[PDB]
Amino acid sequence: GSRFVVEKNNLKVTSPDSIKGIYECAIGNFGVGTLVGTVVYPKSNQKACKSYSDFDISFKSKPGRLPTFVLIDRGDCYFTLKAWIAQQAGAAAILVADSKAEPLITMDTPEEDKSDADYLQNITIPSALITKTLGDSIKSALSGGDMVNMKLDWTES
């Protein structure tokens, strides 16, 4: 089922030491250099299917701090909507953790209704799908108080 036909990229977790290393990810087929950021998992709206502004949540990093990569759960809405919504909230990149343990998948763009078509052309933030294992590892680091920093490389596209 061409289940290993994904365009994979590498990312690097640079901290904490417990989970530091190189991990495979799959860049979204939408949007699109190296970018270092720090990962945040929101306490609400964790699938990024509704506007973060309804929650008064912003991921805009303060001057002098690292850009925010928002960790989002797969499910309930299109991947492209998750990226758009994370982008509207000021995130510098989105990491979508797969909801099941499986080979990486490619986030594809849907065919939308006429009234919901124009946002597809306006997605700019880097978007990557990561495994449930890595998502779970990052969430565990964050819940214990660690800073999770990450370098994204999309030169491989």
């Binding site: 089922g1 061409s2 289940r3 290993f4 036909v5 994904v6 087929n29 797969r74 499910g75 309930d76 809405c77 299109y78 991947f79 080979p103 990486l104 998948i105 490619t106 986030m107 594809d108 763009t109 849907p110």
Partner: peptide, 5 residues
């Protein structure tokens, strides 16, 4: 392996 959701 392409998925919309």
């Amino acid at each position: 392996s392409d998925r919309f959701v």
